[PDB]
Every structure is written in structure tokens, then in C-alpha cells.
Amino acid sequence: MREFIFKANKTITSSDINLKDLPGSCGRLDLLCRCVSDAFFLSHDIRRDVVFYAVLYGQPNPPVCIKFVGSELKKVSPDERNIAIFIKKALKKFEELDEEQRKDWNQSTPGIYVRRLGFRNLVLEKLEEGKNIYYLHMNGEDVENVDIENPVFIIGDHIGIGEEDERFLDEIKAKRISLSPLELHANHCITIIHNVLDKK
Amino acid sequence: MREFIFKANKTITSSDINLKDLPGSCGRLDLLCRCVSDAFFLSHDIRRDVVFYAVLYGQPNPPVCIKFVGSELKKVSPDERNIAIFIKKALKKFEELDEEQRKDWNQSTPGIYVRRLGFRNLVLEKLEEGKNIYYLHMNGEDVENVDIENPVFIIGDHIGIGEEDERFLDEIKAKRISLSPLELHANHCITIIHNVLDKK
Numbered sequence: 001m002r003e004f005i006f007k008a009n010k011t012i013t014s015s016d017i018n019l020k021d022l023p024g025s026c027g028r029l030d031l032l033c034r035c036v037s038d039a040f041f042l043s044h045d046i047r048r049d050v051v052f053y054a055v056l057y058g059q060p061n062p063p064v065c066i067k068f069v070g071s072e073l074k075k076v077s078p079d080e081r082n083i084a085i086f087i088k089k090a091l092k093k094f095e096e097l098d099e100e101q102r103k104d105w106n107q108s109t110p111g112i113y114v115r116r117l118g119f120r121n122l123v124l125e126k127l128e129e130g131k132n133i134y135y136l137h138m139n140g141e142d143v144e145n146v147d148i149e150n151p152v153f154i155i156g157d158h159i160g161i162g163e164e165d166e167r168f169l170d171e172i173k174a175k176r177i178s179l180s181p182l183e184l185h186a187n188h189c190i191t192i193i194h195n196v197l198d199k200k
Numbered sequence: 201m202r203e204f205i206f207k208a209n210k211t212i213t214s215s216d217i218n219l220k221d222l223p224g225s226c227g228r229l230d231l232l233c234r235c236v237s238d239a240f241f242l243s244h245d246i247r248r249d250v251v252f253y254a255v256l257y258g259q260p261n262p263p264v265c266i267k268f269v270g271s272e273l274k275k276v277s278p279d280e281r282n283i284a285i286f287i288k289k290a291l292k293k294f295e296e297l298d299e300e301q302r303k304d305w306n307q308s309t310p311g312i313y314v315r316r317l318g319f320r321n322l323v324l325e326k327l328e329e330g331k332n333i334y335y336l337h338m339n340g341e342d343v344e345n346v347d348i349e350n351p352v353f354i355i356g357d358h359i360g361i362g363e364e365d366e367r368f369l370d371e372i373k374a375k376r377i378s379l380s381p382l383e384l385h386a387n388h389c390i391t392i393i394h395n396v397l398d399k400k
């Protein structure tokens with residue numbers, strides 16, 4: 001399995017979404033959509049061995065976690081508007097639940113689940129599953145050279161993970177990896193990771 | 201410089217663009233937008249050494265070529281909707297011109313130019329300019345072994361370049377290059393080639 005966690009610092013946590021302004025009023029929802037698209041889609045299918053987690057911290061009701069399960073996804077297409085609509089549906093589902101129910105993974109559409117869950121607790125749940133945590137940044141060994149097994153890849157947004165959560169990953173001894181000499185968009189990082197793994 | 205030619209077999213060639221259906225009624229315009237996005241944008245800036253050409257073959261007025269000049273682009277953002285609006289403006293400009301004027305590059309917005317030009321003639325112009333033509337194709341030589349210089353990269357759409365234009369590319373001895381054992385989306389290929397070149 002190939003798994004990803006993307007921390008979306010500013011992305012809207014309400015279904016009151018303006019599809020005509022995914023970058024602005026939705027808090028860079030466009031970037032999240034591109035990350036989902038690049039995590040899953042190939043020319044003639046979907047990567048059935050991928051799970052993608054988005055942790056949304058924007059207003060008005062953070063945190064919200066959305067889990068996308070590649071082997072189960074239905075009716076999702078690679079374009080931003082379609083993905084944004086599925087994220088809107090997941091937030092609408094979240095809005096229909098009480099806080100007790102929000103403790104669970106709550107299915108919205110096939111392969112898409114929504115839950116009250118923040119970044120650090122999600123990472124701990126993945127460690128409990130036996131996953132190895134790898135995170136991007138700068139100084140790390142290139143992913144091509146690292147022995148990768150049962151991976152969860154941490155991907156930051158434009159502003160980034162933040163100082164606070166950065167040391168947490170240090171403390172749990174998640175492996176630093178690099179992909180490029182340049183600072184790339186998050187979605188590009190996903191594509192490069194997939195390519196390295198595909199070639200192995 | 202890093203240059204790309206994307207052949208968009210189905211993409212609309214009028215300004216009658218439905219932003220709510222980039223994939224369908226616009227003829228996979230969403231893919232073209234993703235290719236433009238991935239060709240240019242970095243976390244903090246734009247790749248100023250990139251030129252991207254789109255050759256659009258959809259109805260009602262094909263072919264239309266749009267040249268995007270990285271070092272000149274203004275007000276373009278990486279999201280599909282914004283890029284689609286810039287493409288719509290370019291096609292509107294094209295609609296305002298007579299056929300004599302369409303022989304030229306016609307500026308629409310900063311860094312975006314429109315012209316009546318087909319795929320083979322554009323590649324011939326690039327050959328005359330002294331460029332080397334590389335055709336990104338799944339069964340080419342592994343990119344890591346290819347000595348890339350002064351490149352123009354040919355990228356097909358979902359359907360692909362097609363037999364007629366592949367015949368042409370082989371005749372002019374375009375170099376076939378593989379990026380992955382899997383058949384990827386066109387935009388992913390752009391990201392992979394940028395990474396190869398960035399690492400060099």
C-alpha cells in the first residue's frame with residue numbers, strides 16, 4: 001500500500017463552498033484537489049493500492065479528516081471541480097452528524113469517509129497499524145535511495161506543516177526524505193514519489 | 201530552455217467554454233489546464249525557462265495553437281479554472297482576427313499568444329530553430345540514460361499523438377523517451393521530466 005497524509009492548514013471545513021473560488025474563499029482547496037487527483041489517477045484506471053488522508057484546519061469547524069480509499073472510489077474524475085464536489089459532499093455528511101458519530105469514519109460516497117481527527121492522532125493511528133512514516137522537506141536522503149516499506153508519506157501545504165508539528169515527527173523518528181532540489185507544489189511531490197516506487 | 205508541445209485532439213477551439221464542464225463539452229480542457237499548471241508553477245514562483253505550446257484540434261475551428269511563455273506570464277494561477285479563463289480569452293482573441301492576422305503570434309494576455317498553426321508545422325519551426333525533439337512515450341529509452349539538450353518535449357493527450365503524427369516524428373528522428381513502466385497522465389509526465397532535468 002502507498003499512503004499519504006496532507007495537512008491543509010486553511011482549507012474550508014464547511015460544505016458552503018464557492019466552486020468558482022477554490023483557491024481563495026475555500027482556503028486553497030484547489031491544491032488539495034490536485035493532490036487527490038495526482039495520488040490516484042493513471043491513464044486507464046485508478047491506483048487501487050493508494051489511501052489518501054486530508055486533514056483540514058480551516059474555518060469554521062476544524063479539524064476534519066477525509067480518507068480516500070483508492071480500491072473503493074467511484075464516480076471521481078481527475079479534474080478539480082469534480083473532486084471539490086466530492087469533498088463538499090463529505091463535508092455535508094460531516095455536518096449531518098453529532099460529535100459522538102464524528103468519532104468514526106463516516107462514509108459519504110464510495111471510498112470517501114469523513115471523521116473528526118487531527119494530524120498527530122492520525123499519525124499515531126498509522127504507527128499503531130505498523131506503518132513507517134516518511135516526511136518531506138529539504139535535508140533528507142532522496143526517496144530513490146531509501147528502503148521504503150509499508151509507507152505513509154507526509155505532504156505539507158503551501159505554508160507547510162509548521163514548527164510545532166515538525167518536531168513531533170522528529171520525536172517519533174519519522175524518516176526525512178527529499179525529492180528535488182527545488183521547492184515543489186505538494187501535488188508534484190506525490191507524482192515523483194509514485195514514479196520512484198513504480199520504477200522499483 | 202525547456203519547451204513542450206501538447207497535442208489536444210478534442211479541446212474546443214472557440215471561446216464558448218463551459219467552466220462547469222471542462223472535461224466534457226470543452227473536450228478535456230481540464231487536462232490541458234493541468235499540463236499548463238504543471239509545466240510552470242513552483243511553490244514560490246514560475247519556471248521562467250519554460251515555453252509551452254498547446255495545439256487544439258477540437259471543433260469548431262481547428263487548429264488553434266496557444267503559446268505560453270513562462271518568462272512573460274502574469275496573473276495566471278495554478279488552478280484549472282483560472283487557466284481555463286486565460287485559454288478562453290486567447291480563443292476570444294483568435295475569434296477577433298482575420299485569417300491573415302492568424303498567421304502571426306497574437307498576444308492575448310501577458311505571455312499568452314494565439315496563432316493558426318498545426319502540430320507538424322510547429323515541430324518543423326522548432327527543428328528550424330535548432331531544437332532537439334523528444335517524444336515522451338512509454339516504450340522509449342529510459343530517460344535517465346538519454347543526453348537531453350535544447351529540448352522540445354512532445355506530450356500526447358489521453359488518446360495520444362496518433363499514427364499520422366507518430367509517422368512524422370519518426371521520420372524527423374524524434375528521440376523516444378520513457379519516464380515510467382506505467383502509462384501516466386500527460387501532466388504527470390511533465391512533472392517527471394522537470395524533476396529529471398532539475399536533478400541534472
Ligand SMILES: CC(O)(O)CC(C)(O)O
Pocket residue numbers: none
Ligand atoms: C491524409 C492522407 O492523404 O491519407 C495522408 C497520405 C500520406 O496521403 O496517406
